[PDB]
Design a protein around this ligand. Structure first.
Ligand code: B12
Ligand code: SF4
Lengths: 442, 309
């Protein structure tokens, strides 16, 4: 962030006003406050532009859509590979809703969209946006469609429609900070004025890298930096190419026209094909992915992939290693030994409660590692597990002396029984077998 | 105009050939990251196997067994149907060899391996029962019995290698080298193998992956590190990568548990679990993907036609 003075030293110094400003020094001041871009001055040398533009700054702008509890933030990514350093902001997921639908249908579909939320590893993860599309090609219909949708959800919106449709819908929706779609070569002056008027983020849309960059430069020239990029791929081969280049050029070349997060559409009517294209876009660089499906089974896999890809490997995922009680167990209920990797704990807790089995679960502290990982690492020992049985207090919670091992660690049972003084049962390898084990053997 | 940024990569993934004569399949050879053919070459697409157990599976989900229900007790007929389902390669897993199972011998397994090989027009991958002591005993016998066919033998590990590698060198087979999601472990195992003078183009690295939601992200990054190692000149990393997709995907509760209300339609999510795991690891730079469901294979093959376009 350089002051107008700093950025003026490299200017043409013509004071020709062609950038809209009265003087070079006052043009620089407009850009310093983000009121104009360098592309507004036609005469600035390419050397000076590089010096100024290559000045320190985040390669990809952080863009916010929506406000309050439901705000989406994306951008501020610095790397091409998560092992270089983590991915910072999980991509938004959006579900398309068309305004050719009846008011009733619109509400019922947005209601279903509100339900795409899922427990993964004991945390809730959900779709972030509703993309309302002006397919009716009528301003009044679109505006009533958006108002109607907003009655049934707190999720931020992407508004897809002509400048006329968008202006009508913004009357009500402009205060909810929606993303507008889109400025094109035909409409951009009108779309930018509308964006500034409501202070909302604006998608820039053009075909291929060349046309997208030239369009972004005309728009930043008018002083609008709150931006999402759409290169318009015809298929997932073009999309991967475009996404790779946009991310590479922003980060590796400091190419500022590409210095924003992207939107990507996987709308395919074949759900397997839609889910696979979206998956490619999650893994490679998409800021927002728009889909056509409300089916939980189509969204669950994408939620999960997003979660995984955007996890920071540096963080252990662990639960407090204590006795947990499931469905208010009595002194007679089974005691299941497991580890404190959160994934493992919630898998087991999920199968036990799912089978409606009151029980105790004992997540031994492995530093958040899985059963066989901790075993191979020397972190799930007979000695360790024996200590948990003795000092956790489980001994006072149950009348019996029996505890049940994961089937995959069965080789531990003998030594554990000798150290702990508990009768050790070997359960199934998979927790999915617990229900049947309990029924038959307990 | 925008100047497309083109990496100049020093090197390439070696090209491995499986099978022999009219049965061959080639994979690897990549001088670029997946699909970026503006900066280098992709002489081969990703390749796909479907699994065949020598004796029928006793734990499979109904939705998994159905596509095979007519052939599932006959490993020869089953393998033929895999090929008809579009598999590049057939992966025969010998579960019967298990010491706590039917515990079949080297000689016996050797004959079943020949029968499958003989009935199909594509290369054969052979997977053991997973008990090292037993697998080290049966592979030298199977390899001799199959001598000269160039099968893919799965697999060699840091503490069990020499038997399976010796059979590969003597009898003309290619090997899978398995190490647990670590670059340096995988390299150290490739080194030991090549010290026996098995050629660098006779090896395929197995990262020992997790499926979607189950450690796919660790797998993803190891595989990207493998590709980047190859491309930047690290020759020990220069070999193609196998992922056992189906093996892992179908253990997921999301794939195998037909009633979870929160998770939506079972048929869709069961297949997505395999296809999404596949595509993720294709994006990561994997080469050979060992799958289970023919429908998963069919949709992934379609996705591939689109992304190669
Ligand atoms: C992801 C992964 C990791 C991650 C860590 C993730 C974590 N926090 O643990 C990383 C890459 C760091 C890790 C490292 C290593 N791991 Co690792 N890796 C795995 C991988 C791919 C998935 C582990 C996982 O998340 N499992 C999912 C959880 C949910 O499973 P789980 O805890 O087993 O729980 C299920 C069952 O046990 C059962 N269950 C659990 N509790 C209970 C209780 C009862 C009563 C019952 C009845 C059932 C039950 O049901 C549960 C779910 O439904 C697997 C291979 C694979 N596909 O599984 C290996 C694997 C677990 N790990 C392996 C190894 C050897 C390693 C390393 C030692 C390799 C190395 N670097 O040296 C290390 C050691 C740890 C370390 N960091 O030094 C080995 C273990 C060898 C062994 N089993 O014999 C495996 C099997 C790979 C292999 N070699 O085949 N790896
Ligand atoms: S257009 Fe360029 S030369 Fe003219 S006043 Fe503005 S900054 Fe100065």
């Amino acid at each position: 962030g350089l002051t107008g003075l700093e950025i003026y030293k490299h200017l043409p110094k013509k004071n020709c006003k062609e950038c809209g400003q009265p003087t070079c020094l006052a043009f620089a001041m407009q850009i310093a406050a983000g009121k104009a871009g360098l592309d507004a001055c036609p005469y600035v040398s390419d050397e000076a532009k590089e010096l100024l533009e290559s000045a320190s700054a985040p390669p990809v702008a952080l863009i916010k859509v929506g406000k309050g509890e439901k705000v989406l933030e994306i951008g501020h990514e610095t790397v091409l590979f998560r092992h270089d350093k983590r991915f910072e902001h999980p991509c938004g997921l959006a579900i398309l809703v068309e305004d050719t639908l009846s008011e009733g249908e619109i509400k019922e579909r947005v209601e279903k969209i509100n339900k795409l939320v899922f427990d993964r590893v004991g945390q809730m993860h959900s779709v972030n946006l509703v993309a309302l599309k002006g397919s009716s090609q009528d301003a009044a219909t679109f505006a009533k469609a958006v108002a109607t949708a907003r009655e049934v959800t707190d999720l931020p919106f992407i508004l897809i429609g002509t400048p006329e449709q968008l202006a009508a819908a913004l009357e009500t929706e402009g205060a909810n900070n929606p993303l507008l779609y889109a400025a094109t070569a035909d409409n951009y002056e009108q779309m930018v004025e509308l964006a500034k008027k409501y202070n909302v983020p604006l998608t820039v849309s053009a075909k291929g890298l060349d046309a997208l960059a030239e369009l972004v430069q005309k728009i930043t020239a008018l002083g609008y930096k709150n931006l999402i990029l759409d290169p318009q791929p015809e298929n997932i081969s073009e999309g991967l190419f475009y996404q790779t280049q946009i991310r590479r050029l922003a980060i590796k070349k400091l190419f500022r026209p590409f210095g924003y997060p992207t939107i990507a559409f996987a709308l395919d009517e074949n759900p397997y094909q839609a889910v696979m294209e979206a998956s490619v876009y999650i893994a490679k660089y998409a800021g927002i992915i728009v889909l056509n499906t409300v089916e939980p089974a189509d969204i669950l896999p994408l939620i999960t992939l997003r979660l995984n890809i955007y996890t920071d490997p540096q963080k252990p995922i662990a639960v407090e290693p204590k006795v947990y009680e499931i469905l208010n167990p009595g002194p007679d209920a089974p005691v299941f030994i497991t580890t404190n990797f959160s994934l493992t704990y919630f898998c087991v807790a999920g199968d036990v409660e799912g089978a409606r089995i009151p029980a105790y679960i004992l997540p031994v502290d492995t530093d958040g590692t899985s059963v066989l990982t901790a075993w191979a690492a020397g972190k799930f020992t007979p000695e360790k597990i024996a200590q948990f049985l003795k000092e956790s207090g489980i001994a006072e919670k149950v009348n019996h002396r029996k505890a049940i091992l994961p089937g995959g660690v069965a080789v531990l049972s003998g030594k554990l029984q000798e150290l702990s003084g508990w009768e050790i049962l070997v359960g199934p390898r998979e927790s999915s077998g617990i229900n049947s084990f309990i029924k038959q053997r307990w | 105009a925008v100047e497309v940024l083109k990496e100049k990569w020093n090197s390439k993934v070696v090209e491995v050939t499986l099978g022999t004569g009219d049965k061959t399949v080639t994979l690897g050879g990549d001088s670029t990251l997946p699909f970026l053919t503006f900066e280098g070459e992709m002489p081969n697409p990703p390749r796909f196997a479907l699994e065949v157990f020598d004796t029928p599976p006793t734990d499979w989900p109904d939705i998994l067994v159905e596509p095979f229900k007519d052939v599932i007790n006959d490993p020869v007929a089953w393998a033929k149907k895999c090929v008809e389902y579009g598999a590049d390669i057939v992966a025969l897993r010998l579960v019967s060899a298990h010491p706590d199972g039917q515990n079949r011998s080297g000689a016996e397994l050797a004959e079943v391996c020949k029968a499958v090989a003989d009935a199909i027009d594509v290369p054969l991958m052979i997977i053991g029962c997973g008990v090292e002591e037993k697998d080290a005993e049966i592979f030298p016998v199977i390899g001799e019995a199959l001598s000269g066919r160039n099968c893919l033998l799965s697999s060699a590990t840091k503490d069990n290698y020499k038997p399976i590698v010796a059979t590969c060198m003597v009898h003309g087979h290619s090997v899978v080298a398995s190490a647990p999601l670590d670059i340096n472990l995988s390299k150290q195992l490739n080194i030991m193998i090549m010290e026996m003078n098995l050629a660098p183009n006779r090896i395929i690295m197995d990262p020992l992956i997790g499926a979607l939601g189950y450690g796919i992200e660790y797998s993803y990054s190891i595989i990207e590190r493998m590709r980047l190692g190859a491309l930047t000149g690290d020759k020990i990393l220069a070999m193609p990568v196998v992922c056992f997709i189906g093996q892992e995907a179908w253990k997921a509760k999301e794939a195998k548990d037909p009633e979870v209300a929160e998770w939506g339609d079972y048929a869709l999510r069961a297949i997505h679990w395999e296809t999404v795991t596949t595509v993720a690891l294709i994006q990561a730079g994997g080469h050979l993907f060992v799958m289970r469901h023919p429908k998963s294979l069919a949709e992934v093959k379609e996705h591939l036609k689109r992304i190669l376009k």
